[PDB]
Amino acid sequence: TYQVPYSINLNGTSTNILSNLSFSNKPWTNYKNLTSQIKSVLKHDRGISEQDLKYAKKAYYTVYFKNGGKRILQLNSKNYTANLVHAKDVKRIEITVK
Amino acid sequence: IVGGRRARPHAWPFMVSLQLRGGHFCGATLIAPNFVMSAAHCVANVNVRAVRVVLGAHNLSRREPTRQVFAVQRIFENGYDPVNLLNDIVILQLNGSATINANVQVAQLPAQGRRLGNGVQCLAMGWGLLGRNRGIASVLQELNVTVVTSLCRRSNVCTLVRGRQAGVCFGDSGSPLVCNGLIHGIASFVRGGCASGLYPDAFAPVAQFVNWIDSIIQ
Amino acid sequence: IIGGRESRPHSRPYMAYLQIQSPAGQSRCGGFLVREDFVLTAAHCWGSNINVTLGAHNIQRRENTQQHITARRAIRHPQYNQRTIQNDIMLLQLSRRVRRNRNVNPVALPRAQEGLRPGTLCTVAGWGRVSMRRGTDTLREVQLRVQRDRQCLRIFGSYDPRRQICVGDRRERKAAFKGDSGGPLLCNNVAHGIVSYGKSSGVPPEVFTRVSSFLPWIRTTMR
Numbered sequence: 001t002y003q004v005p006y007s008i009n010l011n012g013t014s015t016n017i018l019s020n021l022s023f024s025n026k027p028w029t030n031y032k033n034l035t036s037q038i039k040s041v042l043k044h045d046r047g048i049s050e051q052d053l054k055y056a057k058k059a060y061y062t063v064y065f066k067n068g069g070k071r072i073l074q075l076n077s078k079n080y081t082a083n084l085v086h087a088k089d090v091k092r093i094e095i096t097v098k
Numbered sequence: 099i100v101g102g103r104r105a106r107p108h109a110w111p112f113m114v115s116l117q118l119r120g121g122h123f124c125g126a127t128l129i130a131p132n133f134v135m136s137a138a139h140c141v142a143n144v145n146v147r148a149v150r151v152v153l154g155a156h157n158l159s160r161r162e163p164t165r166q167v168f169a170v171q172r173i174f175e176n177g178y179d180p181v182n183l184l185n186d187i188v189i190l191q192l193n194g195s196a197t198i199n200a201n202v203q204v205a206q207l208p209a210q211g212r213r214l215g216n217g218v219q220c221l222a223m224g225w226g227l228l229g230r231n232r233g234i235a236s237v238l239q240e241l242n243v244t245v246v247t248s249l250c251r252r253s254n255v256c257t258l259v260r261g262r263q264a265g266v267c268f269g270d271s272g273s274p275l276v277c278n279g280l281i282h283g284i285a286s287f288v289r290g291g292c293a294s295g296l297y298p299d300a301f302a303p304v305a306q307f308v309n310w311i312d313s314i315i316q
Numbered sequence: 317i318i319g320g321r322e323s324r325p326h327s328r329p330y331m332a333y334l335q336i337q338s339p340a341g342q343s344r345c346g347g348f349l350v351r352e353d354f355v356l357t358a359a360h361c362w363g364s365n366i367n368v369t370l371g372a373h374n375i376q377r378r379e380n381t382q383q384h385i386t387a388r389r390a391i392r393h394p395q396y397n398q399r400t401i402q403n404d405i406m407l408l409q410l411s412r413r414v415r416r417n418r419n420v421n422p423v424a425l426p427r428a429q430e431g432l433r434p435g436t437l438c439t440v441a442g443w444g445r446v447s448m449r450r451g452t453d454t455l456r457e458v459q460l461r462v463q464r465d466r467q468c469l470r471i472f473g474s475y476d477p478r479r480q481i482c483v484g485d486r487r488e489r490k491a492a493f494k495g496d497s498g499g500p501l502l503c504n505n506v507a508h509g510i511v512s513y514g515k516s517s518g519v520p521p522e523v524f525t526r527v528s529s530f531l532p533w534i535r536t537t538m539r
């Protein structure tokens with residue numbers, strides 16, 4: 001029921017699809033779960049694997065919040081802030097690899 | 099909190115739940131009748147006007163007459179760096195003053211600059227996830243932990259539960275770390291996952307900001 | 317569609333709006349009717365479940381011209397490469413044949429190896445976003461210029477002129493954008509291209525799949 005648009009920019013290319021992450025009936029998420037879902041759509045949409053990310057030049061995603069701020073998360077970082085985040089506060093997610 | 103136990107009701111009357119859209123998302127500590135202290139990243143990206151500050155709670159799933167609820171009037175930060183997760187502390191001035199009683203009391207802070215050595219025995223607490231399949235805690239949880247300095251930055255207080263997989267989890271951000279009766283830490287970030295058993299949990303080091311905190315609550 | 321205008325309702329009766337179910341969520345694409353039982357689109361629009369809506373103008377409205385049909389097969393090109401976005405073409409076999417009329421009928425495909433000379437003005441249509449902040453509920457369209465291959469070779473490392481078309485003058489703020497994938501590039505009322513990818517900004521040129529290069533696979537698959 002909860003959805004958040006995302007896009008993937010890989011090596012300077014982005015398909016013209018309009019895609020969303022579903023959060024079903026569970027709007028409360030966290031950055032560990034979110035990084036996991038971002039890695040899954042990276043694998044499923046553009047065939048990008050964990051090794052690919054491990055050795056990528058740059059690999060991050062930017063969460064844009066509807067209030068207007070943003071937060072940048074490194075795909076190769078294992079540090080996660082311990083807070084819960086509500087899906088309805090997120091405007092969009094932009095994924096950048098290389 | 100993963101691997102913890104239920105707190106007895108109102109054992110920690112300075113413990114605060116921050117709530118948005120009806121749900122707990124971060125903890126906090128009452129540090130004066132009209133000021134609470136939490137992690138900067140908890141509110142860096144939220145509509146501060148929508149946050150409810152809930153004092154005197156124990157079981158969040160139940161109606162509790164002991165609760166006192168406030169709004170946030172103003173926020174104060176102290177150089178928060180979201181790239182490096184440095185200075186992860188915020189003070190929220192409430193729209194009123196709490197009524198102090200057995201269930202709602204102000205916490206005690208350490209002196210400026212006091213560092214904790216390896217092995218100090220502390221207590222973490224919070225309403226965060228009980229696990230990666232078990233869900234968010236309704237009753238306040240508590241957990242015995244030990245201060246460690248290996249695999250920790252000098253700009254954090256880090257803690258570990260040695261010998262089993264337990265630690266703070268998502269939703270525990272902003273909650274206090276209690277050591278010898280004083281709030282020495284504000285839960286900030288975990289490494290790899292909750293309760294890894296290898297990497298310590300990282301708290302913002304309250305003792306480093308005591309002079310600033312005093313300048314704010316005055 | 318960036319920099320375009322509202323289409324005249326039902327002026328493009330081959331246009332298909334696709335609702336796609338994926339593991340992580342839902343997607344939206346375009347496509348176009350090429351026979352009463354087949355829709356052509358981009359392979360990166362594939363998902364485990366796809367609903368096709370034909371005969372639409374405002375897709376956020378329940379219109380009586382609309383025919384909703386499930387895709388019973390979604391056939392990606394066998395050499396489709398998700399990472400490089402090569403061989404980005406997919407055929408959708410509809411679970412039932414469409415009821416052909418004025419609001420729903422197929423569009424012609426080109427000849428094999430048919431030229432699309434640089435400078436040719438074509439039209440693309442879709443229900444995609446119109447800026448990095450706003451979308452549309454009704455079909456929009458824009459005219460774009462076929463580019464010389466060198467305009468994309470200097471930008472896109474997996475661009476292949478044998479399989480793809482370079483489209484859109486950089487100096488015009490006109491492009492297909494998010495949600496327009498799979499829609500047709502129309503030149504002379506023949507579908508020569510399929511919206512595929514570009515730069516994340518939306519700044520042209522962008523890359524279309526070249527339909528004429530895949531005519532043998534298209535005909536084989538539909539037989």
Ligand SMILES: *[C@@H]1O[C@H](CO[C@@H]2O[C@@H](C)[C@@H](O)[C@@H](O)[C@@H]2O)[C@@H](O[C@@H]2O[C@H](CO)[C@@H](O[C@@H]3O[C@H](CO)[C@@H](O)[C@H](O)[C@@H]3O)[C@H](O)[C@H]2NC(C)=O)[C@H](O)[C@H]1NC(C)=O
Pocket residue numbers: 219220221242276277278279280
């Ligand atoms: C788990 O942690 C609890 C609580 O920890 C203590 O309080 C926190 C709020 C922080 O300030 C921590 O830094 C601090 O260590 C420990 O509880 C404490 O246990 C000790 C005994 O191990 C108690 O002292 C005894 O109390 C009894 C009365 O029951 C006396 O008869 C004894 O002479 C002695 O004084 C202490 O009172 C108790 N504190 C609290 C607040 O309950 C607990 O020991 C610890 N467990 C483990 C296994 O580490």
Ligand SMILES: *[C@@H]1O[C@H](CO[C@@H]2O[C@@H](C)[C@@H](O)[C@@H](O)[C@@H]2O)[C@@H](O[C@@H]2O[C@H](CO)[C@@H](O)[C@H](O)[C@H]2NC(C)=O)[C@H](O)[C@H]1NC(C)=O
Pocket residue numbers: 147148149150167168169170193194
């Ligand atoms: C201080 O603010 C509290 C909290 O207000 C609620 O939370 C805010 C985030 C925002 O959503 C407000 O619109 C909410 O009302 C006030 O508590 C409410 O007060 C009203 C009026 O007195 C009362 O009807 C509600 O029941 C209260 N809600 C709760 C949850 O207690 C409080 O009144 C404010 N105090 C002062 C002095 O301004």
Ligand SMILES: *[C@@H]1O[C@H](CO)[C@@H](O)[C@H](O)[C@H]1NC(C)=O
Pocket residue numbers: 335336337365366367
């Ligand atoms: C397709 O439509 C059916 C019936 O309306 C619905 O159950 C299903 O969820 C839809 N699938 C997609 C991908 O939109």
